[PDB]
């Protein structure tokens, strides 16, 4: 049993994926950097659940930038995030932001 609030991230007391699934309810949106920029502008990618691994969201973006999850690579603060991984145990949830790597910079296609 426990309860509180919580302002300034710590290390040595990170919330755990079950706790930060519950933390909220409803959806949380993710924002996401664009590939090979970010003075630019950012994307709006919101998912009804946090619990969700963090692949189903690199199909999400996939879409739009129209590279396979598997191309593009996905980095959070802590870290490459894995698909095997879920969004909740990175702390991930109306706060954190992810960034998006393109594999093999292309060249002629700039923004």
Same mark, same amino acid.
């Given at each position: ?21 519950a ?6 949106? +993710?924002? @996401?950097?664009?590939?090979? =920029? /970010?003075? %630019?502008?950012?994307? $709006? +990618?919101? @998912?009804?659940?946090?619990? =969700? /691994?963090? %692949?189903?969201?690199? $199909? ?19 870290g ?11 702390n ?10 393109l ?9």
């Amino acid at each position: 049993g426990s309860s509180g609030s919580s302002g300034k991230f710590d290390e040595s007391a990170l919330v755990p994926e079950d706790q930060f699934l519950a933390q909220h309810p409803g959806p949380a949106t +993710i924002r @996401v950097s664009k590939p090979n =920029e /970010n003075d %630019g502008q950012f994307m $709006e +990618i919101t @998912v009804q659940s946090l619990s =969700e /691994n963090v %692949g189903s969201l690199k $199909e999400k973006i996939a879409g739009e930038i129209q590279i396979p999850a598997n191309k593009q690579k996905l980095s959070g603060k802590a870290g490459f995030l894995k698909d095997n991984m879920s969004l909740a145990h990175y702390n991930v949830g109306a706060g954190e932001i992810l960034t998006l790597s393109l594999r093999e910079r292309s060249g002629p296609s700039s923004g």
